Structure 1
């Protein structure tokens, strides 16, 4: 809401999450806002996901602007438990980062592009 400045089409979100699942099985991913944050800061982040149903919003407010001043691409997910399931967790997850994809490097790249284009 306050940290969300653009809306991601249901279809885009689906592709994005899909890439995430293969990312965990083929490449590397970080689950949890703290681990995600360190990715963006350490640079090892290629694509980060942020849920929109987070309360308090404080937990994630920093992701957007932080990512921007680090070039790291980011996309929004409506559900919190969906991003958690995608990342492979039995619980939900406020945010996650694809640390070096895997057989999704192509897709991710496109998603990153589709989003940049989504302004």
Structure 2
């Protein structure tokens, strides 16, 4: 797996992450926008595709998310992450700013945090 992928997310949970993106009211897309959202403290959850190159587009994200106390996780395919975000081309990363469902988001974050630790 790519060096920036710090823990394993099961397929089932990847599909839940894509759904959370797809139902979100507001998101940010791409390394620049996602980084700003995390810096500003407004990202509630960050999802990073596992097949992104070069390394410098997303490498800082796991570290920055930890520092800012923002949960993060992974999906296999940038093409899928793009589709979930409503794009017909890939997306390297996505931040959920306003989720579709607060309760679903809380539980999903909990699962991701269990997987990470």
TM range (shorter): over 0.9
Aligned positions of 1:58-69 closer than 5 A: 58-69=56-67
What's the counterpart of residue 111 of structure 1?
108
The alignment partner of 2:59 has SS state of helix
What TM-score does the superposition give when structure 1 sets the normalisation length?
Answer: 0.93
- What RMSD in Å do the two structures reach over aligned CA positions? 0.8
Q: Runs of 5+ in structure 1 lacking a partner?
A: none
| Paired residue total | 115
Poorly superposed stretches of 4+, deviation over 4 Å: none
- How far apart in 1 are the matches of 2:10 and 2:104? 16
- How far apart in 2 are the matches of 1:105 and 1:66? 23
What TM-score does the superposition give when structure 2 sets the normalisation length?
Answer: 0.94
- How far apart in 1 are the matches of 2:23 and 2:97? 12
The alignment partner of 1:53 has SS state of coil
- How far apart in 2 are the matches of 1:84 and 1:15? 15
